[PDB]
Amino acid sequence: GGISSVCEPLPPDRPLWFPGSTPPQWLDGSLPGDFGFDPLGLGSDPETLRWFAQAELMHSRWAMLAVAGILIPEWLESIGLMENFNWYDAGSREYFADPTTLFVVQLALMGWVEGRRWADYVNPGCVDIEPKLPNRKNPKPDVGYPGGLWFDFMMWGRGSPEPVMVLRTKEIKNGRLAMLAFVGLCFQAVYTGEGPLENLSRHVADPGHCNIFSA
Amino acid sequence: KKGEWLPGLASPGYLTGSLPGDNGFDPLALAEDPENLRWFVQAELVNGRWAMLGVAGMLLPEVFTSIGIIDVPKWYDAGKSEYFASSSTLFVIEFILFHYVEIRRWQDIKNPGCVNQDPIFKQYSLPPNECGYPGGIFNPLNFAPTTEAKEKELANGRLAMLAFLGFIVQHNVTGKGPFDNLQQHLSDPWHNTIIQTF
Amino acid sequence: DIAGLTPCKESKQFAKREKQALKKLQASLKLYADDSAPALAIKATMEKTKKRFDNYGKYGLLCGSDGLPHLIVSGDQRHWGEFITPGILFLYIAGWIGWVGRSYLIAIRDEKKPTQKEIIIDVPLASSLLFRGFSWPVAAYRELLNGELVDNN
Amino acid sequence: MRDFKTYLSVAPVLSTLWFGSLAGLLIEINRFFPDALTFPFF
Ligand code: CLA
Ligand code: CLA
Ligand SMILES: CC1=C[C@H](O)CC(C)(C)[C@H]1/C=C/C(C)=C/C=C/C(C)=C/C=C/C=C(C)/C=C/C=C(C)/C=C/C1=C(C)C[C@H](O)CC1(C)C
Numbered sequence: 001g002g003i004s005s006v007c008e009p010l011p012p013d014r015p016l017w018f019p020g021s022t023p024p025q026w027l028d029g030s031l032p033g034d035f036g037f038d039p040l041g042l043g044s045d046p047e048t049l050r051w052f053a054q055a056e057l058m059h060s061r062w063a064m065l066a067v068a069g070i071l072i073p074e075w076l077e078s079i080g081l082m083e084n085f086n087w088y089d090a091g092s093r094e095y096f097a098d099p100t101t102l103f104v105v106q107l108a109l110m111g112w113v114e115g116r117r118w119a120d121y122v123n124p125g126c127v128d129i130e131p132k133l134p135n136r137k138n139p140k141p142d143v144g145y146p147g148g149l150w151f152d153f154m155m156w157g158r159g160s161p162e163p164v165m166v167l168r169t170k171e172i173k174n175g176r177l178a179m180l181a182f183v184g185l186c187f188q189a190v191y192t193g194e195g196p197l198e199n200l201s202r203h204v205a206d207p208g209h210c211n212i213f214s215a
Numbered sequence: 216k217k218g219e220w221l222p223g224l225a226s227p228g229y230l231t232g233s234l235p236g237d238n239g240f241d242p243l244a245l246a247e248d249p250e251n252l253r254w255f256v257q258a259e260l261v262n263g264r265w266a267m268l269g270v271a272g273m274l275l276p277e278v279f280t281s282i283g284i285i286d287v288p289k290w291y292d293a294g295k296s297e298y299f300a301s302s303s304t305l306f307v308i309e310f311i312l313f314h315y316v317e318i319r320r321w322q323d324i325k326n327p328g329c330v331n332q333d334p335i336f337k338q339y340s341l342p343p344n345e346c347g348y349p350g351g352i353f354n355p356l357n358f359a360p361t362t363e364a365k366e367k368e369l370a371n372g373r374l375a376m377l378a379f380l381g382f383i384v385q386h387n388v389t390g391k392g393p394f395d396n397l398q399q400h401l402s403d404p405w406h407n408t409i410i411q412t413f
Numbered sequence: 414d415i416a417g418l419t420p421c422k423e424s425k426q427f428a429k430r431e432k433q434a435l436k437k438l439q440a441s442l443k444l445y446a447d448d449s450a451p452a453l454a455i456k457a458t459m460e461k462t463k464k465r466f467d468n469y470g471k472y473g474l475l476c477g478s479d480g481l482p483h484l485i486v487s488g489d490q491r492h493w494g495e496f497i498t499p500g501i502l503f504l505y506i507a508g509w510i511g512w513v514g515r516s517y518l519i520a521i522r523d524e525k526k527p528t529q530k531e532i533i534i535d536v537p538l539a540s541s542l543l544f545r546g547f548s549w550p551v552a553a554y555r556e557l558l559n560g561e562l563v564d565n566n
Numbered sequence: 567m568r569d570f571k572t573y574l575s576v577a578p579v580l581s582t583l584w585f586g587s588l589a590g591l592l593i594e595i596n597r598f599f600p601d602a603l604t605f606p607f608f
Contacts, residue, residue, distance in 0.1 A: 044567035097405040104410060119223025126223045243545050243552075251555045465601040472604045482603065494605040502605070533575050 003159035005139065007168065010034055032165065033172035054121060054144045060175020067178045070185060070196065078197050088189045120146070191215065216366070235362050236369030257324055260347050263372020270378045277394045289392050290382075323349070388412050415475060415492075418483055422470030426480030431466045435459060509546035512553065516542045 010029030016036040023036030043049040070087045077085040130148030202210040217232045226239030246252035273290035322330045331341035341351040399407045442455045474482035486496040521530040556562040
């Protein structure tokens with residue numbers, strides 16, 4: 001009737017990665033993108049399952065940001081709005097500081113927030129960033145899905161347009177696709193010796209050739 | 216006013232918050248024993264106060280020398296300077312006086328309120344007081360020793376000990392004054408950091 | 414010149430030993446073309462030998478009559494880096510290991526089956542106690558002062 | 567997964583991991599700081 005802000009677990013007859021097989025007992029559909037895929041049984045322990053879910057979420061978000069920052073500047077260079085973009089050679093460019101001191105500064109700045117996130121995972125609610133306004137009531141967020149004023153300034157979560165489970169599976173699926181994409185780009189940059197969009201262009205033309213088997 | 220050094224972590228049981236400057240920072244469980252905590256409070260107070268005096272002595276004269284008001288040698292080069300007495304006599308005098316005053320302090324640490332009285336002029340005695348904060352003659356301006364002042368003193372002491380560690384490490388790696396290191400950092404920070412001195 | 418030992422940077426026999434080592438390495442090097450991988454490995458070995466001899470000369474080591482450096486452990490301040498400083502570092506690390514092991518044994522002492530925690534190490538408690546040995550001298554000194562280091566049986 | 571982590575916590579596996587990490591650290595130190603007879607940093 002209103003907006004439900006709780007994740008709804010998928011029914012036990014949900015579509016699976018391998019239809020006709022029995023989904024594992026530790027995957028009951030309560031997690032985003034739950035398709036019953038665990039051949040090695042790595043998620044048997046619920047605590048390790050929570051840690052692996054958070055790790056998958058983090059890898060998903062970093063991979064989506066990574067693939068966006070590879071593809072969009074590469075699509076701009078092919079269009080012509082970037083003079084000398086190359087994501088493989090981007091790390092060896094000349095900046096205002098050495099890579100080592102930039103790495104140390106990045107380590108400190110990122111280990112602040114990664115460690116605040118660690119404290120939130122260990123103790124939910126120990127660190128709160130959303131303001132405690134005098135009569136506004138802050139809803140309790142899920143671990144790994146925070147966000148009031150800063151991380152969720154759109155209020156697109158918490159049951160708004162698509163239910164929280166639907167948007168979370170969408171995020172997880174795009175993240176898995178981006179992880180596979182980034183690993184593919186990393187292998188293509190050292191195998192083909194070319195860019196991503198160039199490789200796509202030579203694969204779309206005569207796809208019977210210009211493949212993994214022709215370098 | 217207690218606070219946490221780590222928001223996620225819980226405070227230890229022996230660090231309830233009675234002591235000033237309590238942020239629950241004992242990850243290595245050094246002060247689990249109450250006698251150990253009682254000794255470590257005094258050790259922290261004395262080390263922090265000496266670090267205050269030391270960091271002031273190695274920072275402010277160097278800043279004034281760089282400005283040009285006075286011509287004072289660096290803190291590492293002040294040992295070889297010329298004085299009215301040699302360094303050995305000064306060390307012996309300092310050893311004698313420090314032996315006396317620190318033995319008196321150690322007696323107060325072992326049993327509080329036992330060495331408050333003058334041994335020469337017995338009519339002079341310190342008022343009753345907590346260990347580590349001896350009032351009377353040591354507090355001529357009669358400033359109130361509230362817990363806010365104790366917390367501020369402990370915070371400045373911890374900052375001073377960190378600053379002294381930075382002082383000795385920076386002189387060990389660069390061989391120049393800490394304010395000279397600050398000026399070199401302020402010249403262009405992104406190529407004058409810890410990284411480029413190695 | 415302690416105990417009649419010349420310094421290694423002013424010793425003729427030290428340079429002679431370096432000459433024999435370099436001559437043997439060059440004799441091994443002469444069998445291969447200079448652009449090959451074995452030649453590069455031999456050249457790297459020669460450069461390492463030269464750096465080693467230069468470092469041994471510049472470190473202040475005293476070389477004997479046979480051309481080899483002799484360590485002095487009597488406590489002389491010129492040679493505190495041969496024994497005393499590495500000895501202090503080793504004592505610190507060994508006290509770290511011993512204190513961590515003793516803390517782990519004390520922690521699992523009052524359990525139902527303590528032996529199960531020895532064949533199968535409980536990793537979270539061990540990793541919690543790993544860094545407690547960083548301040549092992551202070552903890553050991555206080556435990557000795559409070560009479561907790563020893564057991565009176 | 568809990569049983570596999572318990573197996574990883576048993577004495578030979580944990581000893582192998584610990585000693586392999588220690589041996590790798592010592593080997594890398596000996597590569598980057600080779601032929602160390604004294605402690606010259608002080
Ligand atoms: C995620 C999707 C993905 C996509 C769309 C592409 C796309 C492309 N790749 Mg990359 N690649 C990927 C992942 C991906 N790759 C991965 C995971 C790896 C290795 C770990 C590689 C390694 C790689 C190599 C070595 C080469 C390419 C090349 C190419 C072209 C295909 C021809 C071929 O020989 O490669 C097929 C290579 C594979 C190793 C197969 C990996 C497929 C993964 C496991 C699953 C993707 C399937 C899934 C249904 C994706 C959805 C499709 C679509 C809706 C997005 C094409 C432009 C070729 C090139 O451009 O030459 C000119 C080539 O040389 N790729
Ligand atoms: C790729 C798709 C994707 C999707 C579907 C989701 C989905 C979800 N996220 Mg995740 N997330 C992602 C990527 C994604 N995320 C990335 C890359 C990060 C790292 C920065 C995060 C980190 C993250 C946080 C920190 C939070 C969420 C939250 C949520 C919810 C918000 C709805 C949503 O994001 O809008 C769906 C639509 C989009 C993602 C469209 C893509 C955006 C385009 C490319 C750019 C944005 C446009 C423009 C530049 C922005 C405005 C400009 C302005 C700053 C001036 C939803 C469950 C919130 C939460 O769960 O609270 C309940 C929470 O606060 N996410
Ligand atoms: C607490 C805790 C807790 C947990 O549980 C564990 C742990 C972590 C281990 C712990 C610890 C921590 C820390 C950090 C510490 C630190 C310390 C310090 C640094 C000190 C200093 C300290 C320091 C000090 C006193 C200082 C002093 C100084 C001085 C006197 C000076 C002198 C001088 C001068 C003026 C001038 C001239 O020209 C020179 C001289 C003559 C030289």
